[PDB]
Design an enzyme around this catalytic site. Structure first.
Site, mmCIF file in Angstrom:
data_model
loop_
_atom_site.group_PDB
_atom_site.id
_atom_site.type_symbol
_atom_site.label_atom_id
_atom_site.label_comp_id
_atom_site.label_asym_id
_atom_site.label_seq_id
_atom_site.Cartn_x
_atom_site.Cartn_y
_atom_site.Cartn_z
ATOM 1 N N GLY A 45 0.960 -1.255 -0.233
ATOM 2 C CA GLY A 45 0.078 0.162 -0.026
ATOM 3 C C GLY A 45 0.909 1.185 0.082
ATOM 4 O O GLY A 45 1.610 1.511 0.696
ATOM 5 N N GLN A 50 1.732 12.771 -2.711
ATOM 6 C CA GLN A 50 2.299 13.525 -1.339
ATOM 7 C C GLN A 50 3.662 14.216 -1.126
ATOM 8 O O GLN A 50 3.905 14.362 -0.232
ATOM 9 C CB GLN A 50 2.129 12.504 -0.296
ATOM 10 C CG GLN A 50 1.032 12.801 0.284
ATOM 11 C CD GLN A 50 0.124 11.777 1.144
ATOM 12 O OE1 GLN A 50 -1.118 12.421 1.655
ATOM 13 N NE2 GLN A 50 0.332 10.708 1.635
ATOM 14 N N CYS A 90 -1.823 3.236 5.891
ATOM 15 C CA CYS A 90 -0.948 4.109 5.277
ATOM 16 C C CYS A 90 -0.438 5.599 5.571
ATOM 17 O O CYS A 90 -0.814 6.082 6.326
ATOM 18 C CB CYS A 90 -1.512 3.966 3.716
ATOM 19 S SG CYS A 90 -0.701 2.744 2.759
ATOM 20 N N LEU A 91 0.191 5.690 4.517
ATOM 21 C CA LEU A 91 1.012 7.469 4.522
ATOM 22 C C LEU A 91 1.449 8.101 5.783
ATOM 23 O O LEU A 91 1.020 8.022 6.818
ATOM 24 C CB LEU A 91 -0.112 8.113 3.669
ATOM 25 C CG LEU A 91 -1.306 8.493 4.268
ATOM 26 C CD1 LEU A 91 -1.339 9.946 4.872
ATOM 27 C CD2 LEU A 91 -2.308 8.695 2.885
ATOM 28 N N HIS A 132 -6.872 3.853 -3.446
ATOM 29 C CA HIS A 132 -6.595 3.396 -2.039
ATOM 30 C C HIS A 132 -5.749 4.342 -1.233
ATOM 31 O O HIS A 132 -5.808 5.029 -0.476
ATOM 32 C CB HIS A 132 -6.168 2.105 -2.241
ATOM 33 C CG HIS A 132 -4.703 1.430 -0.964
ATOM 34 N ND1 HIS A 132 -4.420 0.310 -1.183
ATOM 35 C CD2 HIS A 132 -4.466 1.925 0.138
ATOM 36 C CE1 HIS A 132 -3.576 0.260 -0.191
ATOM 37 N NE2 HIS A 132 -3.715 0.947 0.424
ATOM 38 N N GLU A 133 -4.669 4.458 -2.000
ATOM 39 C CA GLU A 133 -3.355 4.868 -2.077
ATOM 40 C C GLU A 133 -4.031 6.353 -1.719
ATOM 41 O O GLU A 133 -3.765 6.964 -0.590
ATOM 42 C CB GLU A 133 -2.593 4.832 -3.270
ATOM 43 C CG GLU A 133 -1.328 4.019 -3.439
ATOM 44 C CD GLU A 133 -1.620 2.440 -3.120
ATOM 45 O OE1 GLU A 133 -2.119 2.140 -2.015
ATOM 46 O OE2 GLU A 133 -1.389 1.854 -3.979
ATOM 47 N N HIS A 136 -6.815 6.925 1.036
ATOM 48 C CA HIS A 136 -6.047 6.900 2.454
ATOM 49 C C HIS A 136 -5.906 8.221 2.720
ATOM 50 O O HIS A 136 -6.290 8.686 3.625
ATOM 51 C CB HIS A 136 -4.765 6.091 2.087
ATOM 52 C CG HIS A 136 -4.322 4.799 2.216
ATOM 53 N ND1 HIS A 136 -3.254 4.725 1.625
ATOM 54 C CD2 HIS A 136 -4.240 3.621 2.728
ATOM 55 C CE1 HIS A 136 -2.677 3.674 1.489
ATOM 56 N NE2 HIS A 136 -3.446 2.898 2.329
HETATM 57 ZN ZN LIG Z 1 -2.331 1.410 2.291
#
Ligand SMILES: [Zn+2]
Length: 147
Positions: A45, A50, A90-91, A132-133, A136
């Site tokens: 993921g 960003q 994530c992130l 998704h990425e 998120h």
């Molecule tokens: Zn993810």
């Protein structure tokens, strides 16, 4: 290669996606590298965007139709079927968990990495995985989405 966007020693300072209208240079890597990812990822993921300010050309390679290593976007959208979320977290410090995203199939009125506007539906586990990425991050449900 994979898209190596950055966080924490980066400036995202809470990044969302900034829709697709035009193209720049990095754009190629969003497509070309999401190929390298969309295809060599579908596991950990990433968070599709960003580093500083953004754009989002997505990808597909002989995925929905009898196309080539084509692209999909997150653009100026038209249809948005179903919702799901991925069990990631994530992130901008990818700890914790959640289902930030909410997509199944989504059609666009977008633009590719040429500077050519394209209207197409994005489906499949990856459409939902690369969004998704950034679902998120711009699909934001989570809480802090550790940003
Ligand atoms: Zn993810």
């Amino acid at each position: 290669s994979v898209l190596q966007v950055l966080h924490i020693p980066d400036e995202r300072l809470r990044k969302v996606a900034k829709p697709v209208e035009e193209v720049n240079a990095e754009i190629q890597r969003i497509v070309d590298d999401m190929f390298e990812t969309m295809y060599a990822e579908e596991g950990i993921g990433l968070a599709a965007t960003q580093v500083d300010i953004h754009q989002r050309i997505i990808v597909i390679d002989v995925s929905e139709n009898r196309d080539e290593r084509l692209v999909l976007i997150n653009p100026e959208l038209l249809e948005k079927s179903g919702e799901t979320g991925i069990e990631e977290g994530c992130l901008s410090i990818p700890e914790q968990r959640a289902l930030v995203p909410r997509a199944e199939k989504v059609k666009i009125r977008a633009l590719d990495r040429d500077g050519k506007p394209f209207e197409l539906e994005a489906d499949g586990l990856l459409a939902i995985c690369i969004q998704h990425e950034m679902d998120h991050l711009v699909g934001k449900l989570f809480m802090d989405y550790l940003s």
